[PDB]
Structure 1
Amino acid sequence: MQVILLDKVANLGSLGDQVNVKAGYARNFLVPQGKAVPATKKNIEFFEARRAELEAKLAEVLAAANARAEKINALETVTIASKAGDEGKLFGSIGTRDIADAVTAAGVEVAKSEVRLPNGVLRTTGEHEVSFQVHSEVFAKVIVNVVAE
């Protein structure tokens, strides 16, 4: 499938590329997200004129992502209380829902898919590192401390 990219994607190209991808890749990912559109005559022409608009919007969202990553790095310490037994071991877990709800309690809102917990789902109490991304580039970090309820 001959597709035109509406944003920079992975190792395919930047905004504006007559790229040949597999049909399942175009059909199931790149078109139902706002990342690509097929190479139709109208489509081609449309993009050409909208190229400027896109470039702009493409940036306004990287600046907002950098501002949100700056607010995450300003926050830098979030506390969650949960049930822990003896030896500092959680009977439950600290979910992505709990991390996101604690971040919304600390500041302005952050949804569920933005957290990139590298090891697990925080089965023990103590100081843990959780990554947050709001774009394809920025990878900011949060110290999370779990205390006993």
Structure 2
Amino acid sequence: MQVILLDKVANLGSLGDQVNVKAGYARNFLVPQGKAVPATKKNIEFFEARRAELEAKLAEVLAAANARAEKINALETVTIASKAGDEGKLFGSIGTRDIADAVTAAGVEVAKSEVRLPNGVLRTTGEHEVSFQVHSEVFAKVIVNVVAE
């Protein structure tokens, strides 16, 4: 499928250029997010004034700086521990629905945690690393509790 680009999704592709993508992937990633669209060749002459010089005017203030010195300097153990017995086996991680859980409900939704692992998912017991959001693009790290008190 030929599509016109709207977002920075290609290293040789630019706003208002035509690229060929498989339709199942275009309908999964590009079209519903307003990042590239079918046809649209008749509208591109306005994209520079309507989008390019609009996004670049926000990128003149957001953030106009490099690196943070708040909430981000530390490393310590957190109140989060892993559920496992004396065989040391986890039997597959339930991740975002168990890692911060305190009630283990069955009639209602268990709230999805916003934490991020450096390895994506947990697999084994012991002293693993986890992180949480401290700003719109910035995450702070901690290690899990193994004393289980």
TM-score range, shorter chain: 0.5 to 0.7
Q: How many residues align?
A: 149
| 1:35 CA displacement | 1.6
Q: Distance in 2 between matches of 1:101 and 1:61?
A: 38
Aligned 8 A contact 1:78 1:143 in 2: yes
Deviations 1:53-73 (A, max 9, x none): 553387489749987997566
Q: Distance in 2 between matches of 1:4 and 1:110?
A: 41
Q: Distance in 2 between matches of 1:102 and 1:67?
A: 34
Higher helix share: 1
Deviates more, 1:30-39 or 1:93-102: 93-102
Q: How has the CA–CA distance of structure 1 residues 50 and 69 changed in structure 2, closer, same or farther, with 3 Å as cutoff?
A: farther
| 1:30 CA displacement | 0.8
Q: Distance in 1 between matches of 2:51 and 2:105?
A: 39
Deviates more, 1:101-110 or 1:27-36: 101-110
Structure 2 unaligned runs (5+)? Answer: none
User: What is the match of residue 71 of structure 2?
Assistant: 71
Structure 1 unaligned runs (5+)? Answer: none
Q: CA RMSD in A?
A: 6.9
Deviations 1:94-132 (A, max 9, x none): 612345779999999999697664657434432213478
Q: Normalized against structure 1, the TM-score is what?
A: 0.52
Q: Percent identity?
A: 100
| 1:80 CA displacement | 0.9
Q: Considering only CA atoms, is the larger Rg found in Structure 1 or Structure 2?
A: 2
Aligned 8 A contact 1:77 1:143 in 2: yes
Q: Normalized against structure 2, the TM-score is what?
A: 0.52
Q: Distance in 2 between matches of 1:107 and 1:74?
A: 38
Q: How has the CA–CA distance of structure 1 residues 45 and 62 changed in structure 2, closer, same or farther, with 3 Å as cutoff?
A: same
